[PDB]
Amino acid sequence: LTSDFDNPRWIGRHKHMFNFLDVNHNGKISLDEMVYKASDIVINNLGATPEQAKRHKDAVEAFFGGAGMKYGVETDWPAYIEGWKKLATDELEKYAKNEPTLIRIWGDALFDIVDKDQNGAITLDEWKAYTKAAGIIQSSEDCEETFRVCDIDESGQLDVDEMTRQHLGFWYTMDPACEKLYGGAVP
């Protein structure tokens, strides 16, 4: 439940993602681009209903919002990483107080789209469909590493509650137990 913001591997994890989000190498990204990307994936690749898409958009907006990003503002790397320090701090504070995190809220919205059974858990094939559409993982072998790192349930599925815990460790705290969550795709 403690952050590790001076760790070069934390900083570099998020710089990897900044660079991945900055698809046209502008050195800056906007909230507009984030919510476009989000809705493009779920509506155009993953079959989301209109209601599901709007729920998902609201969650992504709130997530990057928590990192300081705003509509009509171009966020460069120094502003992006400083805002990520605020997001991670807020998220860990919520998690410690048993309050829903922004990453959980996003997960619930995403999993309602990706889980054909709408019961809060995804198969490996579903995780492959999501991460390859998003681009955050490219290869099947890296998607398969997720399922090695995560505690998989009795039906072979990845529950949103488990992925949220792994995400806290991976994106917010540098928990060694959560290394390689995205395989080699994200250092």
Ligand X SMILES: O=C1N2C=C(c3ccc(O)cc3)N[C@@H](Cc3ccccc3)C2=N[C@@]1(Cc1ccc(Br)cc1)OO
Cite the active site residues. 14, 84, 130, 167, 182
User: For residues 58-97, which are near ligand X according to CB under 6 A?
Assistant: 60
> Does 58 carry a binding-site annotation?
no
CB atoms within 10 A of CB 42: 26
- How many CB atoms within 10 Å of residue 58? 15
Q: How far is the CB of 51 from ligand X (least distance, A)?
A: 18
- Dihedral through CA 138, CA 141, CA 144, CA 146, nearest 10? -60
Q: The tokens 């993602």 sit on which residue?
A: 17
Q: Which stretch binds ligand X (CB under 6 A): 4-12, 32-40, 43-51, 70-78?
A: 32-40
Q: Which of the stretches 23-31, 47-55, 90-98, 159-167 binds ligand X when contact is defined by CB under 6 A?
A: 159-167
Q: Among candidates 182, 186, 187, which has minimal Cα distance to 141? A: 182
Residue 150 phi, psi dihedral angles, 5° rounding: -75, 150
What span, in angstroms and rounded, lies between the C-alpha atoms of 107 and 91? 14
Q: Which residues in this chain contact ligand X in the complex, by CB under 6 A? A: 14, 17, 34, 37-38, 41, 60, 103-104, 106-107, 110, 131, 134, 136, 160, 163-164, 167, 171
Name the binding residues for Ca(2+): 22, 24, 26, 28, 33, 115, 117, 119, 126, 151, 153, 155, 157, 162
